[PDB]
Amino acid sequence: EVETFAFQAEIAQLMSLIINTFYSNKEIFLRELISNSSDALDKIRYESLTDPSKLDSGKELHINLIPNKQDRTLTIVDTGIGMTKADLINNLGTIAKSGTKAFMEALQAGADISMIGQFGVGFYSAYLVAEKVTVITKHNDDEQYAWESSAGGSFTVRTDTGEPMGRGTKVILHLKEDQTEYLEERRIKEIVKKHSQFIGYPITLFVEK
């Protein structure tokens, strides 16, 4: 059973701006997603100090980068706190409304798209390089869900029947045809070294078989 939702108008407008604006410095999408993963890992680490059972779903706190040239996907996996169904459908987009407005006004005033993370809506920078984004997520207090959107004003949410993840989030970037450089090991290494060198969790870049 698949549920289809409309983005709020302001978020759809943000997504269109990211997709349509000419802006060559697309590589910053990875910094934003890794920063998001680091934030989710910080949250489960903090919560597990006052409740160690919150790590019964997995003790390891890490980030994995998995390219797949056959599927033309780049997957960012973390074992952070995960997201509830309410997070996916309503809470996070509601919060993003204010950051989107502030980001819009900053852009009109001289800012550029690389500053998106200073406004708290860095997830949507995924559409700099992806034609479709799939988010698989598992929070301790909810079931495993799959969120998905190719923009165009709508997204879907369904219960995920695939491999159980334990806890955390996978962001699967279905890359645009002209953005396959982000599947190359040397290119991902360069970007992580440039923009994510001090992330406080191990980042493992998987190799293709």
Ligand SMILES: CC(C)(C)c1ccc(C(=O)CC(N)=O)cc1
């Ligand atoms: C579309 C889903 C529900 C996956 C999502 C996730 C995160 C955010 C943010 O705006 C927070 C951030 N980027 O750190 C907004 C929406």
